[PDB]
Subunit: 355 residues, 3 copies
């Protein structure tokens, strides 16, 4: 087909992007989780998210203004708090008693705004809180260079399978994976990789840890050496669903700044390092934009733990009380890359000799 | 959600626009009431409306030509009368006996073309005939300056609620409503308003009567004074449904011509008066294009008769024999604007003082 | 309505176009029969068609490359044969044993690529094989000048009715049909026509045989004389479904080259002959793009065998074992054009006299 669409959105923290982009004193609209949301900061700078359409007569709160700690609807100026409470009908004798719209719980981590989603309507388990990335604040590192695209005709689950995919590193990312291991446990699914650049594409040695913390947000630590020169990168791979067949895919890059040369040159290099990582990610995007998901895939041993990863991902789409132990218990596997590398080295060699 | 879509289009007269725009010797296509229609004038200039697709093999009658009193299909030239009768198959030995397509009953009032729609297929109650507006013919007034837009992702019921909306006059139209009363009876729902311009936006005094005559057509008489100079306007607010989630919204303006100065200057002023009224209407459009309808609204006393207006509007979506007395009996209410005006005057004052 | 959409695509040979356009050493994507297909030639130049999305993890085979006799998926380079077999996973210890994707049976006739479709999944009856057109190879004739358009909001059955349509030759093609006969038998439905140019449009005498061989592919032999000068044309009218409400309509023209004058002038004329035929076809396209299908048409005697043609066409949408004799037995009819021609000649005369 392949695969009945999910009937709920995933339970978890979803990143909506860089926090400071949701400030500038105004509210902002975001289409997400089958609805429209309004994001706004109160007078203390703390960020809030509500259902976007006013509970009075359907005005678009995202196109209103911020007055104090509330968002004012552009239609009749009703004031809504970050907790969803109707704080004031400015022209009325009586503001409604205990009126509320839906509030979405927020979090700011590493200069990124997150929103909690749960079909069951329960608040975040503190155990799944998205980790701080100290390097974001550190002035030894750049600040987020962020991107976003809308992908249509695809569900967001269609990109999670990359976690278990060893062989695509050769064909898509033009490198030779000499080490590959997955670990799934609780709310975290991880990929550990050693990757060597291909001689036949113009060598680099990459060590990569990448972990999804919950269903939608992956931090990828990139430790690359090109001879003796080490470089350090952190890449965010994240998304949020718009509908069950469209989603917003976002990536953000920071790099350790080279220490030290002219400020002007440090910038020039850091731009190259960043752009490089982004082109790496864009290689995956191109495949994601031009593929379908296969629910009943044809698999070889080298595919690794496709079924187990998907089983892990299922935990976010069932009620917490129905989470099965096989979704969350520690599972690990190392994929043997030896034979693939012998074959690939031959392909690489054949290509060099050929010119 | 909010609100299950209606399962039929409203029973009533719907305006398709300015009659003379449907002449120029040819037929015209209109998408309406979930189908396509053909509009055309016979040899006496009288305007007719049929289902647009030919009952023979599906040719588009709207792209045919007018021959005498019939529209000729562009495919095999069959002739269709304004009453839907198949008058002639030009090349055939025998024209079908008593063949008919669906005819739509028409009316021309005040230089505007109207069409009758009724799910039950009954002809117009003469009691709901759209009133003549003498000012249209009068050469003391301009001629219709008409506009139309297609609004998508909204049902046309989503704009009727403005009738009961006192408070939006301040936030959307930048005036202070010191008088506000609704009257609903039979097929007519009306709003009577006294409105004063806000000092803090750069004063005008407006008296307004606006009545929907049936479900889709509102005439608005605008009696404005700016000091000692009175001006008279008539504004048409009307629509027709295209689908249950798109509709065409149209507005038309005429003004009493200032009497009297140079013909050239009279035109110059009348253009300003007209453009002014249109910008008033466009303020509502902007809200209508950027909102949702709330089926179960959160209401304050100041909202007035939201539920009663909607109940009145329901009469057009039930079979005539099922019209309930509470939809059509006289209902009236005056909304007390005193407190709102004290509050608003304070807001206005605060803004002046602030600069 | 008119007409419930079909629930399967037609059983038959469908032309995807000119074979050589599907070569140039790469694979090609085609949206058809509700899915996406990949077309590619193996190392012997023989053309193949598979389901377009890889059975592994959903890569787009149409965007891969051809390696030897297989198409290589762009994601993990798996090799797929023209018969759908998984020939090789290049990096794996073991290629899957007896893995297959869906293969589509192909045929090349007259320099055109064809694909077999059958909901029942059975292979082509050799009896319905598309005939060779020797004139394609002959260097006394031009080579295919081919066109294609996507028609949206219409099912492909909506164009088959032209076969039975005598009267449209006057109104759409501006000629006078003095002879008209249909013959339906087995998998072939044909129209034989003698057509005379109208005096009142700026005379030509056309003899035309046009036959659908199966549900989607029509060959039209055009024998035209303009005085003493005969010209010979062959026109292909064909389509394939994309969805049940969109299809690709294609037409191809070849003409007997005038024998003989300068090579340069022979080309100049042949371009005119071709362009002429194409403008003839484009007259039908314009009606097809602007009409609906009528499931329960209003008919006159002159319509001929509308019901019988549709009954013939139904054979392709039922299981072979359920094909009813009345779909496939020989049916023929001649439509009497005499009276229509008297009437038309009068219309023509009236138009000449009028200027
Ligand atoms: C973020 C990412 C994609 C989605 C996924 O599931 C796992 C990873 C980790 C490896 C990343 C990759 C993005 C592209 C990267 C930067 C390369 O070009 C080399 C390493 C690789
Ligand atoms: C036509 C209308 C909208 C729809 C509706 O339901 C009722 C009215 C009557 C008041 C009109 C308004 C249009 C905008 C106007 C001209 C102003 O800017 C001041 C008065 C106001
Ligand atoms: C291919 C065709 C359309 C579809 C169909 O069903 C049958 C025919 C045969 C007659 C063709 C016509 C195409 C247009 C042609 C070339 C003319 O302008 C004169 C003859 C006519
Ligand atoms: S619609 Fe939000 S205040 Fe009225
Ligand atoms: S389709 Fe209207 S006349 Fe044949
Ligand atoms: S998706 Fe086709 S080879 Fe993996
Ligand atoms: Fe990747
Ligand atoms: Fe208004
Ligand atoms: Fe034709």
């Amino acid at each position: 087909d392949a695969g009945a669409l999910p009937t709920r959105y995933a339970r978890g923290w979803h990143c909506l992007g860089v926090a400071k982009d949701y400030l500038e004193g105004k509210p902002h609209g975001v289409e997400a989780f089958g609805t429209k949301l309004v994001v706004f900061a109160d007078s203390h700078g703390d960020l809030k998210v509500l259902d976007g359409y006013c509970r009075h007569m359907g005005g678009d709160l995202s196109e209103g203004t911020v007055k104090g700690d509330e968002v004012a609807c552009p239609f009749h100026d009703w004031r809504w708090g970050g907790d969803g409470r109707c704080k004031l009908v400015p022209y009325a004798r009586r503001t409604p008693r205990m009126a509320r719209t839906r509030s979405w719980t927020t979090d700011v981590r590493s200069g990124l705004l997150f929103v909690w989603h749960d079909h069951e309507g329960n608040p975040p388990d503190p155990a799944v809180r998205i980790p701080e990335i100290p390097e974001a604040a550190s002035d030894e590192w750049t600040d987020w260079r962020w991107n976003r695209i809308l992908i249509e005709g695809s569900n967001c689950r269609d990109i999670i399978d990359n976690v278990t995919d060893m062989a695509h590193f050769f064909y898509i990312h033009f490198g030779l994976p000499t080490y590959f291991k997955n670990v799934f446990e609780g709310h975290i699914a991880s990929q550990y990789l050693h990757n060597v650049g291909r001689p036949d594409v113009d060598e680099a040695h990459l060590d990569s840890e990448a972990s999804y913390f919950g269903p939608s947000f992956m931090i990828n630590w990139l430790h690359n050496r090109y001879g003796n020169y080490k470089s350090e990168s952190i890449l965010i791979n994240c998304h949020y669903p718009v509908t069950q067949n469209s989603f917003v895919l976002q990536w953000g890059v920071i790099v350790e700044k080279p220490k030290g040369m002219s400020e002007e040159m440090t910038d020039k290099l850091s731009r190259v390092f960043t752009e490089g990582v982004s082109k790496g990610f864009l290689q995956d995007v191109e495949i994601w934009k031009h593929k379908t998901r296969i629910d009943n895939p044809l698999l070889v041993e080298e595919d690794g733990a496709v079924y187990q990863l998907r089983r892990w991902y299922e935990q976010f789409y069932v009620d917490v009380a129905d989470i099965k132990p096989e979704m969350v218990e520690r599972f690990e596997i190392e994929v043997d890359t030896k034979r693939a590398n012998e074959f690939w080295n031959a392909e690489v060699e054949k290509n060099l000799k050929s010119r």
